[PDB]
Design a protein around this nucleic acid. Structure first.
Ligand SMILES: [K+]
Ligand SMILES: [K+]
Ligand SMILES: [Mg+2]
Ligand SMILES: [Mg+2]
Ligand SMILES: [Mg+2]
Ligand SMILES: [Mg+2]
Ligand SMILES: [Mg+2]
Ligand SMILES: [Mg+2]
Ligand SMILES: [Mg+2]
Ligand SMILES: [Mg+2]
Ligand SMILES: [Mg+2]
Ligand SMILES: [Mg+2]
Ligand SMILES: [Mg+2]
Ligand SMILES: [Mg+2]
Ligand SMILES: [Mg+2]
Ligand SMILES: [Mg+2]
Ligand SMILES: [Mg+2]
Ligand SMILES: [Mg+2]
Ligand SMILES: [Mg+2]
Ligand SMILES: [Mg+2]
Ligand SMILES: [Mg+2]
Ligand SMILES: [Mg+2]
Ligand SMILES: [Mg+2]
Ligand SMILES: [Mg+2]
Lengths: 51, 99, 148, 203, 193
RNA sequence: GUUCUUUGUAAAGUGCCUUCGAAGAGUCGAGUUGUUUGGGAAUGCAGCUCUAAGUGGGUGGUAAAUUCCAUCUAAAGCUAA
RNA sequence: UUGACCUCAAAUCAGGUAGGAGUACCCGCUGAACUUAAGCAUAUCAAUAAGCGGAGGAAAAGAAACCAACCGGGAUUGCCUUAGUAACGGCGAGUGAAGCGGCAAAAGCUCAAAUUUGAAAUCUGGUACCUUCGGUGCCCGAGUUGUAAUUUGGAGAGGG
């Protein structure tokens, strides 16, 4: 929710809504970066999850 | 399009055996590109209309396409661009409530 | 060669042939084409009638190659044939095996009909032909074939 | 990718979202210094199109340039010449505000090379540009054969010589009949056309 | 300064023309230098004819379309029909022009034929072989000279049919001059309510 | 040229079938102003205002509407003689 | 309370870089007037002198949003022409290109926009060692707001 140039992600909710992909706007590109071993990540996706 | 063999008239020129070269991939720079269509549709749905586009839709619905095209030619460059913009705006109007 | 000029002969004569009364001053009548309408009007009108004003319509971006069309008169019509073959073509003025002359390959665009040609058939390939040129070529038993 | 969406979105500049962002960002740029380092491109897709890469040695600078005409700097409007030269207030500075921006940025970061620049914002007083510069001393640039061309001394201050995109545009460097005056260089063409060529055996 | 009966002259020397006066004193020095450069370039490159094989091509602008001349490079179609790839042709000494297109089978066939002749008259040295020194010939243009195509025969039978070629030209020109007016007249005569 | 290397089941090219084919925006373009050009209802450049499209766009040296055609592919970049 | 992130700072922090000179030629900006027009204001001189910024051994331009209208040519540059011509111009004085053609020299190309996604495969730096215009290992860091590979319209890519 804190991407400093916001145009990078403003179309993401609409893209996810058009393609029927669940999306959540969540606090922290820093938190997503900790998720993916980066400083910031600005997105985090799950395509396959274990059974 | 065949030359007539003489140096004057409509299809003047020498009769040469034609070949029809293979089409260049240029001449298709403004091509269809389903990707562009999808991206442009999404951006058109997330960004709204521009203020002059809103004024143009209003003019189409309240004063007619000739007034709308006059205003669109004043706004954009040329008459061809005005025509295309007015067709796009009335396509928007047709996709709108008057489906 | 300076030793043959009259300025070597004017050495010792004060005015250098330019006169004592009207000397050689800088530009007594103006520079270049000055005063062509005011104090050089007589010299403009005599020896240059038509110099001032406009006479026709303009042509933006004219290309001379569009108008390239060299004219060959009928009076030659045979210098395009090689000298050696010309004698045996003049002899045996046959409607068959008539010499073919590519006037475009020779570098001409229109065949005109000034002179007169011998009474021998010739196949003239040209881009354009004068009416009388074609009439004379046909009267000589030849033909004009249009090319481009 | 997202760069296609960025490119399409940046073309809707009078949409509500881009108008809001334009206002907020123009206020922020006006609050910052006239020339100041930008931490990242404001338009990363535009920077990529103009040759920026997100690696060490690529630098973004934001620059503010005064809008309007070039007033003739003569004292009291007196030009001391013929009336055809008396003009002071409608003279137009045959060089872009973008060129002025990137020249000032290059003078500030003289150790870098101006690769390109792009418009980011404007108000009535100012036009705002982001200048992409390359560090020709950085080893990531001196290697990486795609970019070490700009390390060559022939590319020193190409923004000051008009060798960037806006420089070539203002110099009129384009092909065809519309650019006969300026195809190989205006003054070079003029010298060629005003040279008297005299051979040994005069023609 | 308008004197006696003389043609009006237009000598353009009202600028500082003496600041730009190129006298080609170096014509002979530059010719010697061009010959020296040709010699060292020939010695530098492998036995190789100092220039690329150029295609045959028709000049534009009817002033010159009657003649044929060397072009920039062989078209992609010509190279493919000669059996080469453009990259390999460029490496074995054929100029390739991606811009030029083939709409003339005569020129296309001629260029394919001179490409085949070039391939049959060149020896390509293997990168890891011996290929004994093969007596470099300096000119590919002299080896494969551009020939002007012959169109007709020296003598032929007169086949006059009474068509009056002058009249044919007049009628072609008149048809062009009135094509649009007659087209609009036939547009307005198809009214039929 | 001579010799250790052996690169590498890595890399490249080539035929056919099929689905595609992303191609640069305050930019093009337009108005106006100034300058400039041989460029003349406006050659380039620049300021301000307007501001595109995608079988699109630019050009085709007389402004405009209409219908075609031709030719290239901008708004990013390197390059010896 | 602790740990990040973003942005912004500081250090005589580690390593670098810029300035100035020259300036014949080169790339731009800025920019006259004398002069010519037998006066003079548009024009001319001149898109020149002076002023300013910026390079190299050459620079610039350069692989077509070109020229054309042909039976089509095919990056750029330069020469001979085109041509004192088309055109511009108190249509006055004056100015004034370009296409073709011959020749010199020739050379072609690469990014952006693509999911590597079964594996950031990318790179600066520090350090140890070495065969030191660099290499390897290790370690921080840069980087997913995208660094590699793959493609550049002449194409080309994914599948068989
Ligand atoms: K006298
Ligand atoms: K002055
Ligand atoms: Mg005496
Ligand atoms: Mg005396
Ligand atoms: Mg950084
Ligand atoms: Mg100003
Ligand atoms: Mg492009
Ligand atoms: Mg000026
Ligand atoms: Mg380009
Ligand atoms: Mg360059
Ligand atoms: Mg230190
Ligand atoms: Mg003087
Ligand atoms: Mg005077
Ligand atoms: Mg006087
Ligand atoms: Mg006076
Ligand atoms: Mg000076
Ligand atoms: Mg030096
Ligand atoms: Mg040199
Ligand atoms: Mg260079
Ligand atoms: Mg290209
Ligand atoms: Mg060319
Ligand atoms: Mg002449
Ligand atoms: Mg002039
Ligand atoms: Mg490949």
């Amino acid at each position: 929710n804190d991407v400093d140039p916001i145009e990078l992600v403003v179309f993401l909710p609409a893209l996810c809504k058009k393609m029927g992909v669940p999306y959540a706007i969540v606090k922290g590109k820093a938190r997503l970066g900790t998720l993916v071993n980066q400083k910031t990540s600005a997105v985090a996706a799950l395509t396959e999850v274990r059974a | 399009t065949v030359k007539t063999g003489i140096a004057i008239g409509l299809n003047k020129g020498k009769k040469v055996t034609s070949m029809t070269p293979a089409p260049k991939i240029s001449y298709k720079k403004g091509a269809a590109s389903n990707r562009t269509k999808f991206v442009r549709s999404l951006v058109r749905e997330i960004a709204g209309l521009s203020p002059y586009e809103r004024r143009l839709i209003d003019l189409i619905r309240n004063s007619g396409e000739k007034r709308a095209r006059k205003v669109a030619k004043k706004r954009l460059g040329s008459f061809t661009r005005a025509k295309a913009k007015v067709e796009e705006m009335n396509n928007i109007i047709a996709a709108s409530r008057r489906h | 060669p300076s030793r043959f000029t009259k300025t070597r002969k004017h050495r010792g004569h004060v005015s250098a042939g330019k006169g004592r009364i009207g000397k050689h001053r800088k530009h007594p009548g103006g520079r270049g084409m000055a005063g062509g309408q005011h104090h050089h009007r007589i010299n403009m009108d005599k020896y240059h009638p038509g110099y001032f004003g406009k006479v026709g319509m303009r042509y933006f971006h004219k290309q001379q190659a569009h108008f390239w069309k060299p004219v060959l008169n009928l009076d030659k019509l045979w210098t395009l044939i090689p000298e050696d073959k010309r004698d045996q073509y003049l002899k045996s003025a046959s409607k068959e095996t008539a010499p073919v002359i590519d006037t475009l390959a020779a570098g001409y665009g229109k065949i005109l009909g000034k002179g007169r040609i011998p009474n021998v058939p010739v196949i003239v390939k040209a881009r354009f032909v004068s009416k009388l040129a074609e009439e004379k070529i046909r009267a000589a038993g030849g033909v004009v074939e249009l090319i481009a | 990718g997202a760069y296609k969406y960025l490119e399409e979105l940046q073309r809707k500049k009078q949409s509500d979202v881009l108008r809001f962002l334009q206002r907020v960002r123009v206020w922020e740029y006006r609050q910052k210094n006239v020339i100041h380092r930008a931490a990242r491109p404001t338009r990363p897709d535009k920077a990529r199109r103009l040759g920026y890469k997100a690696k060490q040695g690529f630098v973004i600078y934001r620059v503010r340039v005064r809008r309007g005409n070039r007033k003739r700097p003569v004292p009291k409007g007196a030009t001391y010449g013929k009336p055809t030269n008396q003009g002071v207030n409608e003279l137009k500075y045959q060089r872009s505000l973008r060129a002025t921006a990137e020249e000032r940025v290059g003078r500030r970061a003289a150790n870098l090379r101006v690769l390109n620049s792009y418009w980011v914002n404007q108000d009535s007083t100012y036009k705002y540009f982001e200048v992409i510069l390359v560090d020709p001393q950085h080893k990531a640039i001196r290697r990486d054969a795609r970019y070490n061309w700009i390390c060559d001394p022939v590319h020193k201050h190409r923004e000051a010589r008009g060798l960037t995109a806006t420089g070539k545009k203002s110099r009129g460097i384009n092909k065809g009949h519309k650019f006969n005056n300026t195809k190989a260089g205006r003054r070079k063409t003029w010298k060629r056309q005003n040279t008297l060529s005299l051979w040994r055996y005069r023609k | 300064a308008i004197s006696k009966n003389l043609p009006i002259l237009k000598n353009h020397f009202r600028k500082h023309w003496q600041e730009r006066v190129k006298v080609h004193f170096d014509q002979a020095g530059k010719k010697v230098s061009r010959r020296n450069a040709r010699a060292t370039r020939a010695a530098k490159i492998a036995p190789r004819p100092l220039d690329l094989l150029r295609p045959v091509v028709r000049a534009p602008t009817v002033k010159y379309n009657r003649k044929v001349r060397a072009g920039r490079g062989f078209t992609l179609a010509e190279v493919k029909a000669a059996g080469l790839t453009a990259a390999y042709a460029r490496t074995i000494g054929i100029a390739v022009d991606h811009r030029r297109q083939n709409r003339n089978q005569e020129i296309f066939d001629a260029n394919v034929q001179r490409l085949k002749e070039y391939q049959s008259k060149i020896i390509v040295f293997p990168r890891n072989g011996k290929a004994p020194e093969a007596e470099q010939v300096l000119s590919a243009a002299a080896t494969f000279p551009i020939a002007q195509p012959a169109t007709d025969v020296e003598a032929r039978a007169v086949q006059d049919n009474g068509e009056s070629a002058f009249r044919t030209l007049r009628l072609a020109r008149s048809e062009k001059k009135f094509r649009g007016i007659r087209e609009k007249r036939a547009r307005e005569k198809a009214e039929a309510e």
